[PDB]
Amino acid sequence: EGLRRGLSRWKRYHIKVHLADEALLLPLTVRPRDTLSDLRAQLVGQGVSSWKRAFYYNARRLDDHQTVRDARLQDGSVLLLVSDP
Amino acid sequence: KRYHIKVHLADEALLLPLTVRPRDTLSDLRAQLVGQGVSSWKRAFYYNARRLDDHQTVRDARLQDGSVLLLVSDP
Ligand SMILES: [Cl-]
């Protein structure tokens, strides 16, 4: 049932957010429960100007309330953070 | 002199290292990606989210060691 996922409560993904505008790769440690909003909040804590920027994975736009699990991210996954004028 | 850059293939979500010379054109980088099986037809390079011209050199695009380019498929 949920035994497997139960025994992995402390699972952390080490991912990368490619900030397109800065051509920078920011590493984030994230939980599969985290929403992209949590990721945005982490990035804001690093001074990333998040206003009017969206996440893309496999070149498709992600809704801010998807989770790291729903986005099917894993260790090493690279997200793209894209400005919209 | 060689730079070690990365190309972020947006569709595949992969980060491909390339070794390039400052005088390499982006057309040369494309041929490297094609040699690695990257389906490059109608994909363009972006840096700082500005579309790049294939005739531009690594040097003139102001790339350096560790620069991350972005390869994006066209409309
Ligand atoms: Cl040459």
Numbering used by the authors:
A (entry chain A): 2 to 86
B (entry chain B): 12 to 86
What does the paper say about this structure?
To best evaluate the impact of these alterations we analysed the structure of the TINCR protein. Structural characterization of TINCR at 2.12 Å resolution revealed a UBL fold domain composed of four β-strands forming one β-sheet (β1-4) and one α-helix (α2), the lack of a characteristic C-terminal di-Glycine motif required for covalent protein conjugation that is present in all other ubiquitin-like proteins described so far with the exception of UBL5, and a 15-residue long highly conserved positively charged N-terminal extension (herein referred to as “cap”) as the most prominent features. The “cap” is visible only in protomer A, as it is buttressed by two neighboring TINCR protomers. However, its high B-factor values suggest that it is highly mobile in solution. Finally, the TINCR crystal structure stands out for the presence of a distinct basic N-terminal “cap”, whose highly positive charge suggests a potential role as a recognition module for either phospholipids, negatively-charged regions of proteins, or nucleic acids. However, unlike most ubiquitin-like factors, the TINCR protein lacks a characteristic C-terminal di-glycine motif7 (valine glycine motif in UFM1) required for protein conjugation. The absence of this sequence in TINCR points to a specific role and suggests that this ubiquitin-like factor may not function as a substrate for lysine protein conjugation. Projection of TINCR amino acid variants identified in SCC samples on this structure revealed a protein disruptive effect of these non-conservative amino acid substitutions (p.Arg5Trp; p.Gly7Lys; p.Val18Met; p.Thr30Ile; p.Ala42Thr; p.Val49Met). The distribution of these point mutations across both the N-terminal cap region and the ubiquitin-like domain, together with recurrent loss of translation-initiating codon mutations, N-terminal proximal truncating lesions, and locus deletions, all support a loss-of-function mechanism. Similarly, the introduction of a compound p.V18M, p.V49M mutation resulted in almost complete abrogation of TINCR protein expression.
The TINCR (Terminal differentiation-Induced Non-Coding RNA) gene is selectively expressed in epithelium tissues and is involved in the control of human epidermal differentiation and wound healing. Despite its initial report as a long non-coding RNA, the TINCR locus codes for a highly conserved ubiquitin-like microprotein associated with keratinocyte differentiation. Altogether, these results demonstrate a role for TINCR as protein coding tumor suppressor gene recurrently lost in squamous cell carcinomas. Ubiquitin-like proteins often serve as substrates for protein conjugation and function as signal tags that are involved in protein degradation, subcellular localization, signal transduction, and epigenetic regulation.
